[PDB]
Amino acid sequence: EDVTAWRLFIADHDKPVVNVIDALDGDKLATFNVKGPANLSRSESGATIFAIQGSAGVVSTIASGIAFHDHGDHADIDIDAPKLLPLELTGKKPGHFVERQGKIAQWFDGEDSAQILGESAVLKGQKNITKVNVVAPHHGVAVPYDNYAVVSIPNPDDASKRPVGARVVDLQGKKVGDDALCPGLHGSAGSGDTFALSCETGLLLITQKNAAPVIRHLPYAKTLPEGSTSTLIGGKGMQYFIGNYGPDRIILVDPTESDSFRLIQLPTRRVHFVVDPVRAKFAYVFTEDGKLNQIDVLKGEISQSVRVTDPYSMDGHWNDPRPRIAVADNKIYVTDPLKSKIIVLDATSFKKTSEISVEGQPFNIVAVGGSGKVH
Amino acid sequence: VTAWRLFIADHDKPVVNVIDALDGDKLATFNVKGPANLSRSESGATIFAIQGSAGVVSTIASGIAFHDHGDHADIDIDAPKLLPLELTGKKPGHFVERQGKIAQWFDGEDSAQILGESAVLKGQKNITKVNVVAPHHGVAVPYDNYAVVSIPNPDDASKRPVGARVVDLQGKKVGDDALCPGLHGSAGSGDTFALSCETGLLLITQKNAAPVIRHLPYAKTLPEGSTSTLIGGKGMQYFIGNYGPDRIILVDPTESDSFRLIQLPTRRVHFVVDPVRAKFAYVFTEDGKLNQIDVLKGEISQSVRVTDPYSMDGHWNDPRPRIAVADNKIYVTDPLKSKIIVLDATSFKKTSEISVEGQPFNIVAVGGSGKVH
Ligand SMILES: [Zn+2]
Ligand SMILES: [Zn+2]
Ligand SMILES: [Zn+2]
Ligand SMILES: [Zn+2]
């Protein structure tokens, strides 16, 4: 038969719980108790979910229960119950998580090393870690490559400031080549074979073929107004990045083209954004007015908006829970933490079709899934 | 005299259209029983329309065949036509032709079907049924008086097969099992046939005895990943496989360092080899680009945007482009726009868009050049 399966993973803002919900009909598949409130990341394969618990000093790992086999003209889908895996990563203040092609790099803001591992080992229940020295504890990022990593460089005068650039290291932590300076580095995302790190002058763009990774700097277009990016997302089916650019602007970046940057002005301040992995021409931004906004990436504009929640005006209460967006199959999911629900929209009509009740303050959300044959 | 033809299956309708590759003109439309995957014979004389949901494989005389004088070669050009021969059985799957021997797998049967290409064009339905122990999603490779067949999982055959073995044409085991967990992916290139699995490749060769299977493990220097789908060089001996969805591996079975990795810009939608200029292969990626692979250099040598993006997320059977090479052109189906894009294989410049009613999807090309008089 032919089976479609998608799952939501939803972290509570206050309680150390991750809920798993069937995205297609909203029923509860599992509740996992962890140590602290979590931020969530999925692997590219979708087979693992990582729950980063900064205040608890741990990263927990969940087997999503959905995995695929690439068989050319068809795909197979393997479906099992979601489960908490034995793999935990421990260290002071876990921060940015980056996974690509099964390679995993977990940053720890309070440690002098990042932890590199692999998804295939994790799924088998093996913990096989490489600790890579990052010189001094700082709020940084590590990007995993074949036999190398790219790591942020701590500010040499006060490591509590933002990092000052990035460098290639081998997996013994040995610097390779020259430092790529990028003052005020913060923000990271991948899109296809290109990884981006944002800073005050532009983006660092990283690729790897059959040698060490190569870092190039793309400065912000001179046609842009003053600003810089501190948070990034990356297209899935098409190569691009979207960054913030001040609190009510975003930029769209094409790393494959010379006419690289386009500015979109939002009517109110940005709460969250995500790309649509299924409909590659679209991304979504949620704004403080309570509206979900459809971004037409190729036209470089907001193509439509719809009210989903009451306003979450962020001026003055920057720390409180706010909506987060996920996409699964042909639906868009928006958490409404203050109402203990998730709003479900049809992606193409851009209208609400259902809502899912989730006790607590459902906050961070990621989705995995697809369809395949079952023989 | 030159003649090339394209056979194009609709994604949803039981239709196979035939187009003259040189001017784009529609030549024929064949109505079959269900939506078809398409395979061609090595000779190009026959096209096979595998209709999984319909329980049948139909056979089409392409209308282009070659016969010799020794060497030389004449090109015999006729209208394409449906042939009476049909293979029937539950859930036809993998088609493997090797040297005019054809092996058709049926996921729902306990036997695979072996036949000759010649015997099809001559109207003969002489099917040899080779027992494969239990129904499973496997593969059979035909040899002279033997076949190599996948081994079903002994627990439940519903899982992926666990290896391959040589059998006689009754299905009686010959020799020892070649274990290869999670076996899937099959292609031939020159004197070697490859099956991929989670530990590496099985490589099959044959002289005057049973075929011989050896295991080529993935090089320990490779990143984590595995291969589950393969294509084989035609005119140069190599294999190309996936290695996760946005990478391919190039495999040279004659080199001790057999594996070379290539990073794709985005995830792979389809790939084929170039049978005319054998040092090239082509990968279509979800970003809508066609990528030329220079196999000798081990690199992507050029890329061009051909379609809108077709993300590999969604459903596995959302309609997406497929590639075929004919003469000095490359053809890319664009199912959601009811058309085929034509590019010059050297310059990668688009020369034509051929509209085809429906959702043109799977595509294969046959043809060549010979004398007539
Ligand atoms: Zn298959
Ligand atoms: Zn399969
Ligand atoms: Zn941060
Ligand atoms: Zn002649």
Numbering used by the authors:
A (entry chain A): 31 to 405
B (entry chain B): 33 to 405
What does the paper say about this structure?
We have recently identified a periplasmic protein AztD in Paracoccus denitrificans, which is able to transfer zinc to the cluster A-I SBP AztC23. Here, we describe crystal structures of AztD homologs from P. denitrificans (PdAztD) and Citrobacter koseri (CkAztD), a pathogen of the carbapenem-resistant Enterobacteriacea group. In each case, the protein adopts a beta-propeller fold composed of continuous antiparallel beta sheets forming 8, 3-, and 4-stranded blades and containing a disulfide bond between highly conserved Cys214 and Cys231 (P. denitrificans numbering). Two high-affinity zinc-binding sites are identified, only one of which is competent for transfer to AztC.
